[PDB]
Amino acid sequence: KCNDKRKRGERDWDCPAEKDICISDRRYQLCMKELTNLITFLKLNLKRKLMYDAAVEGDLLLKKNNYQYNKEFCKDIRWGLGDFGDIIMGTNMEGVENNLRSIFGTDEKAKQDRKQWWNESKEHIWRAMMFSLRSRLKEKFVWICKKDVTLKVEPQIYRWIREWGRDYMSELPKEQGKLNEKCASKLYYNNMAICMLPLCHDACKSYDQWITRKKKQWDVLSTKFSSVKKTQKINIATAYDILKQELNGFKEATFENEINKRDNLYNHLCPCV
Ligand SMILES: CCCCCCCCO[C@@H]1O[C@H](CO)[C@@H](O)[C@H](O)[C@H]1O
Structure with missing residues (x-):
């Protein structure tokens, strides 16, 4: 379940005992539901699931910043998309692993350029995240989220x-x-x-x-x-x-x-x- 995001500041960064990193409350809430649920049909299905999770993440992020289209929002979109990336590509430093095994049993266990798969489409996932806000603003929508910086791996x-x-x-x-x-x-x-x-x-x-x-x-x-x-x-x-x-x-x-x-x-x- 992807719950409503808590205010930024309610829980500070978490440097867990004996760990190589510190994680934010922004990622502990990262919508990973449809991923942790599960030929080309497989990749298509995972694509759709990721679409759902990305969209919901965008919506909940918008809700988190009191429905304000601003810099903080765009930043959160950027981070969420990036983390989605390191999840897909599998280069995530963070510590579940049910998605690390689901996305593994769906593709490959030797050389894994699922890199390119993410690369082939992350722009689309991005529009999925930006979907809620843009569907809410309609014509009044403007691009304040600088795109290629957001998509740059x-x-x-x-x-x-x-x-x-x-x-x-x-x-x-x-x-x-x-x-x-x-x-x-x-x-x-x-x-x-x-x-x-x-x-x-x-x-x-x-x-x-x-x-x-x-x-x-x-x-x-x-x-x-x-x-x-x-x-x-x-x-x-x-x-x-x-x-x-x-x-x-x-x-x-x-x-x-x-x-x-x-x-x-x-x-x-x-x-x-
Ligand atoms: C020579 C050193 C004397 C220092 C006296 C500083 C003046 C303090 O005085 C107070 O300062 C406040 C603002 O800081 C004002 O809002 C108060 O009205 C005033 O009483």
């Missing part, structure tokens, strides 16, 4: 890093906001004392929790970026460069400085830690 590690980047850059002003709202004091307050006092202390340590799991996540995922190329190698090198390419304003310095709690704001508001 890339190792998920990359995709998940971009997604994580958007998540972090989206959560940061919120956390800084609530921290500042519960710690900021007038210029004649000793902010050390305010920091110690319960209200600002709890908030500061909550911030600490958030930035701690943020650094843990980025650690695992970056070690994971450097994990792959070595093993895989074969279009960018600086893991950060990906992040440099994702959002409008990103400098490495401020980032490292933020996740290592060497932040100016954090060190000013809560110095009692």
Whole structure:
């Protein structure tokens, strides 16, 4: 069953015990129903099932962002399609396996360019994901989801890093906001004392929790970026460069400085830690 998607932020990234990666709540909800249900007829049937799952995923993603056609939505479409890809192609880092065996007993157990099969049609799966929204907007529909960037095949590690980047850059002003709202004091307050006092202390340590799991996540995922190329190698090198390419304003310095709690704001508001 593909259930209604939970709000982004309700469950942060999950770096499971003893694992090579960190997974988002966006994929734990990824519609994989018709896949985990099951000549050329086989490939056609799997194609249709994937059409169903992709369409439902698109619809539930639209519902997830309160029926708002925007950048976050397009991003989620991109990630979902990519993950669908690594599922089909079988190059998924993530840990079921009933679809990894179903899609195996339907095609091949030696060399498997199901690669090309996905390549032959992923555009169509994409229109399947974009189906709901476009059928809802009708004539009023416009293309704000840049297509060939969305269809361009890339190792998920990359995709998940971009997604994580958007998540972090989206959560940061919120956390800084609530921290500042519960710690900021007038210029004649000793902010050390305010920091110690319960209200600002709890908030500061909550911030600490958030930035701690943020650094843990980025650690695992970056070690994971450097994990792959070595093993895989074969279009960018600086893991950060990906992040440099994702959002409008990103400098490495401020980032490292933020996740290592060497932040100016954090060190000013809560110095009692
Ligand atoms: C010389 C150092 C004295 C510092 C006094 C800072 C003035 C604090 O004063 C307060 O600042 C608030 C805004 O920060 C205002 O909203 C308040 O009306 C004001 O009482």
